[PDB]
Amino acid sequence: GHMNITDIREQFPILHQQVNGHDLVYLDSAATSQKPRAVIETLDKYYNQYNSNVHRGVHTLGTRATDGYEGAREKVRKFINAKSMAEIIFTKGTTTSLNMVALSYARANLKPGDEVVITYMEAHANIIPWQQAVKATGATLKYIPLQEDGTISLEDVRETVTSNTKIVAVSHVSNVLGTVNPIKEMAKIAHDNGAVIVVDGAQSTPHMKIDVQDLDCDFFALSSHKMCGPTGVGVLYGKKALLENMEPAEFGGEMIDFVGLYESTWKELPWKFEAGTPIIAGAIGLGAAIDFLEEIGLDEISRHEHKLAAYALERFRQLDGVTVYGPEERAGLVTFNLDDVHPHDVATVLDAEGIAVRAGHHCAQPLMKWLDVTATARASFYLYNTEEEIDKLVEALQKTKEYFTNVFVDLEHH
Template identity: 60%
Template sequence: MIDADKIKQDFPILFQSVNDEPLIYLDNAATSQKPRQVLDAIQHYYEHDNANIHRGVHTLAERATTHYEEAREKLRRFINAASTKEVLFTRGTTTGLNWVSRSFGDSVIEEGDEIYITPMEHHSNVVPWQQLAKRKNAKLVYLPLTADGFVDVQKSAEVISAKGKILSVCHASNVLGITNPIKELAELIHQQNGYIVVDGAQSVPHMKVDVQALDADFYAFSGHKMLGPTGSGILYGKEALLNAMEPVEFGGEMIDFVYDYESTWNVLPWKFEAGTPNIVGGIGLGAAVDYLEAIGMDEIEAYEKELVRYVLPKLQTIEGISVYGPADPELHTGVITFNLDGVHPHDLATAFDMEGIAVRAGHHCAQTLMRYLDVHATARASFYFYNTFEDADRFIDSLKKIKEFFKDGFI
């Protein structure tokens, strides 16, 4: 079992007071905190190796290039991509999904084709496909969900047709706390000679992901949700598909040769990485992978499951609380979304903040899902492996206290 109290010592930001209360950070689905090891890697780069990569022959440039490409290899191994050619550095999940929809989508979608998404998708996995459907006069189709909020594979098999070219789905929901059956969905769309795109923002930080075992055609995720810097991320794509795609950004580094009136492109993965990249972001993300692997992704997933087994039943016993997603802790990730009768989620989150507890409130960039659930907004507590059982107790105790305040007018 993970010793969260010990691990917490690596995260300096967690040792502060908010509104005169010790900070409890439960907004990990929005962004994770960063351990000293990642902060040290960032500082070391700027103090010792700061130079542009791939272009210089001087010592600093060569060191920076080496560290950056070593980070790419760490990410390749982390998700079990077949080659570093399949691992593209991006600004995050949103960038990766936009690259796929704009380039690959434009090349394979024709008028009348179908693009499949689900009601639970983050806006970054909705809007790009809406725009693609408009550009190509294609049809955007929403796949059905089970009562617990999973994509219903059996009913989806009846929806997905020979017109289906792309299925884009989150691996884990940032609201419902579910993990979708990606391999089964990949099989469905591949049977129609289509392609699957996976939003892995909420899965890669919390579980072991093998893109080859999942048979994902594309898989995008963000560094900042997995202990890495903001503005960093990865787009995985099968090599043959990436080779067939056109770049969507143009400039330095991604070219092979620039003639007067046309240009040729660099080889993978640099074909898509125009301009000076977020070098320190990539290096910091590599350091985050080192940290996660030292603990073990299976251990992280198991510990978070223990936290959910502990906190979810306690939450469900509080009168007036509605929890969204599976009621069974065994089916639930560390993302727990809920509402308290009669209290707006923003007021609830503000009250938590007065207790020193950071939770999220709003539509969580999932307005389609809010309409599906018939709510305007929800509150969300999202746990990570540096959260302790004491954090969970304070969350539950504070919620009970807040409930009494809104009921009786004192706290």
């Protein structure tokens, strides 16, 4: 059935501590997520019982490690509904996956006159690799305009994407606006113009079901650390036909077939793109995180986050002098600012109340400029957060407004 948030919170040891004498209120899961005991104890069991290098088939522990690693690959394949494990590449994270597409696909498929089309809301991981690729190839970088609630219209996509567009790169979910972008429709638009579509799914994958066959995305990148999994591991999905034609981004052992003095041949997919000893423990722990989320149910997690987001938006609208950026329909996060209070001070005060949020530009400086701000604060939610924690957040924001206005008034009287 429905989620028992008490039972879920019980599985996350890190939630049960105090900060500055207050119960921890962790509202920074868009920066990184916390881990349940299932994931941590998966890492423990790996290092305690069957650590060895993989892909030798030589001794017992090595076989167990290989089975764990490749079984985690199959767990990922099922999780995003990829057709084949050949399309599932383990990487360092979303940033590396996107850079891999930029090196091995973009720089080999861009000529002067070609276009790479991104959006103003993209995180830096989905901007700078394309900047560098178009600079290296002499191609053109174009931006889809946002609308004025921070969403994307399909006509702006049709207008920006042309017959010279070879790549459209876009986030599934914005880590700043909470916008859920129309990825499937944009994929169909990109394909109609002869382009591939690259989906930054770092912020969607933890929170909603991903079906890359229904999305028909050509590439899809995700990060373990945002979805209850270990740090330092992510996934690049790519359509098998595209991955077959791309050259490796890294070279070394494990990704070879034959090595001569001057020339070498590569393994089949996916191992062609996995050079050196892989992220064995982290990948196995990501598989454990997938098992955990699937046991809870991603549709349940999405519904819980929709409830939290609607509650948070309503309660934020009860606060005077608070600006919220983005649309009403959104993922589980709220980026905001207090009138006449810098978000860094908001965040410092909140942490003094035990509440953890970010303040800054959230790796989206062009979006900050588009919002006509220099910095923002952001509270983000996930499957272990509650409406009570959102109450604490809005009460502490009212605290902060009153306190800074009172300090201002006391400095007037000087």
